[PDB]
Design a protein around this ligand. Sequence first.
Ligand SMILES: [Fe+3]
Length: 242
Amino acid sequence: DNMASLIQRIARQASLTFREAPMQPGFPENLSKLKSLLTQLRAEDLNIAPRKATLQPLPPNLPPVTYMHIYETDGFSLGVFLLKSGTSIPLHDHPGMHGMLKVLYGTVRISCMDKLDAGGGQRPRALPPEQQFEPPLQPREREAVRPGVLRSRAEYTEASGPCILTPHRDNLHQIDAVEGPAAFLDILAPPYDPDDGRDCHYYRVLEPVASDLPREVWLLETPQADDFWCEGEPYPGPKVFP
Ligand SMILES: [Fe+3]
């Protein structure tokens, strides 16, 4: 038994997944193997202890979420996001990216959405002039409204399987920490690159004047929220080599 750390094995397999005799795995098989490794991942595998709620309100001085960088190549990024109590990663997309996440401690509510896409056989409609929202929309925001669907809204814990998204399915999500702090490992491929036109866009669901899922919604892109930001903090777990 000469095994590497689980995080090193996760990183290797992500590298093979997202990048003659005998034939080595294809992408579906490699993705399924990656997901099998992520199912085994515990917070203790990363030397991260669970965090319990702090009682003081979160002042503007402090970030609601922190990030621990683990590894990245041009194929994928590998990190941990740690959410304080009562905080959220607001609704955002992953343009042309695959993603996999695994809760390490706590509980999160993940709301999974998609913009309606004519490449998927949908026929996205323009926002009709009649319907209105609270708050009302400025005219040019009306022109930017895009139809979407809210697919699911479930709670995940470290006992749940990994949450997977693709470039065209569950590509938008919001992550709420439920009843205390929470953390999750995230794999994204390719990584974001704000300087090469692959950005994290934020969105809001419009409130127009049945709670059943799935349901159609209207989505409006929005700037990163004033009070949402995510600063780094030291990663304490095993190093990914080199
Ligand atoms: Fe995300």
